[PDB]
Amino acid sequence: SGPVPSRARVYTDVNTHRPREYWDYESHVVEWGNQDDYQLVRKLGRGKYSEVFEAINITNNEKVVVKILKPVKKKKIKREIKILENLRGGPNIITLADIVKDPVSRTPALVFEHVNNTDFKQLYQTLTDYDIRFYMYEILKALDYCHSMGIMHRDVKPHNVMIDHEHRKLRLIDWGLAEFYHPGQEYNVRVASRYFKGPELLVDYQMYDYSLDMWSLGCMLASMIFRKEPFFHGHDNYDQLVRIAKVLGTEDLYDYIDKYNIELDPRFNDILGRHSRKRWERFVHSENQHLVSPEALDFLDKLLRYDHQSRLTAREAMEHPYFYTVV
Numbered sequence: 001s002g003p004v005p006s007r008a009r010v011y012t013d014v015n016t017h018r019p020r021e022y023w024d025y026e027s028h029v030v031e032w033g034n035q036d037d038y039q040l041v042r043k044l045g046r047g048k049y050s051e052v053f054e055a056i057n058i059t060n061n062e063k064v065v066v067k068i069l070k071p072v073k074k075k076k077i078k079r080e081i082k083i084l085e086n087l088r089g090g091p092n093i094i095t096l097a098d099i100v101k102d103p104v105s106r107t108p109a110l111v112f113e114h115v116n117n118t119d120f121k122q123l124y125q126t127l128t129d130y131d132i133r134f135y136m137y138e139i140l141k142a143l144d145y146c147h148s149m150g151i152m153h154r155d156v157k158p159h160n161v162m163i164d165h166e167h168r169k170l171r172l173i174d175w176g177l178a179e180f181y182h183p184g185q186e187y188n189v190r191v192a193s194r195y196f197k198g199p200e201l202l203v204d205y206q207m208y209d210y211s212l213d214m215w216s217l218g219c220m221l222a223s224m225i226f227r228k229e230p231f232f233h234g235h236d237n238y239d240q241l242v243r244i245a246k247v248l249g250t251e252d253l254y255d256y257i258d259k260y261n262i263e264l265d266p267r268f269n270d271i272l273g274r275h276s277r278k279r280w281e282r283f284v285h286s287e288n289q290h291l292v293s294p295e296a297l298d299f300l301d302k303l304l305r306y307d308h309q310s311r312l313t314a315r316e317a318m319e320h321p322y323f324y325t326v327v
């Protein structure tokens with residue numbers, strides 16, 4: 001009939017044993033405060049659904065980021081807000097400081113803590129072996145926490161990891177694609193950003209879980225230790241799987257789709273071809289050798305797997321020999 005069902009190996013029934021007020025974001029009442037307290041100093045950037053500004057709070061003159069929202073369906077706004085409130089105070093989770101509206105324009109905005117970020121294309125080249133280990137462990141704390149809280153980030157990528165290198169402070173940001181995990185649920189596979197999408201999304205396997213974030217983290221790690229950003233560089237979602245298949249090999253791909261009885265797109269038949277598994281040592285060279293080790297490769301190996309169930313969980317990852325030098 002259809003695909004074989006799947007469950008998360010960790011934190012499976014975490015939302016199931018909690019009351020609906022926790023996960024039923026659609027019934028959440030959002031209270032919009034006054035934006036007057038925040039004066040905009042300068043623009044930082046602009047997202048697909050918002051425009052981010054640096055701002056200062058006139059109440060206490062503390063630095064802040066204001067995410068002025070474009071018109072979006074209130075269901076998705078309620079979802080992001082509820083997830084941000086549920087996860088507030090957690091390790092390395094960006095703090096939602098306030099929910100506000102401009103009195104006159106009525107335009108809704110989310111207020112966040114400010115992180116004195118260093119652009120990742122400048123920063124990542126500077127990072128030592130110990131730095132990559134340190135920051136990966138900070139990300140794993142955020143992910144294990146949010147996973148334990150029954151939430152998938154679903155958009156892990158360098159753009160969503162704010163790092164203040166001077167203060168060694170890391171914050172996982174932009175929970176706009178995040179979602180509550182309910183075992184059995186068939187989710188929308190159009191999440192994450194192309195280069196960081198797990199094979200489950202690309203073959204359209206809907207019953208995915210927290211392990212989607214661990215694939216994406218693996219993509220980040222590969223890019224950092226090998227100095228190849230992005231690591232998997234497809235021209236579209238179809239070609240993204242081809243790029244993956246040219247590294248992990250096509251045999252394990254077809255074993256994966258066979259195991260889960262995944263209905264593969266006809267377009268894939270032509271474009272995937274046949275590719276052997278390329279060893280991780282093939283990506284090590286004179287300019288990245290210093291960032292690579294047996295433990296780094298073994299860690300990466302256990303993140304970048306087709307089978308989502310076979311990937312390290314966040315808690316398992318934090319116990320890997322790679323982090324023995326950090327913790």
Ligand SMILES: COc1nc(Nc2ccc(C(=O)N(C)C)cc2)ncc1-c1cc(C(=O)O)cs1
Nearest residue numbers: 044045052065094112114115116117173174175
């Ligand atoms: C743009 O996004 C952010 N940026 C920052 N800091 C900075 C970003 C960029 C520079 C820089 O390099 N200059 C000088 C432009 C400096 C600081 N701090 C928090 C966020 C958040 C995003 C989100 C979100 O999407 O949810 C919640 S906070």
Ligand SMILES: [Cl-]
Nearest residue numbers: 179188190191
């Ligand atoms: Cl969605």
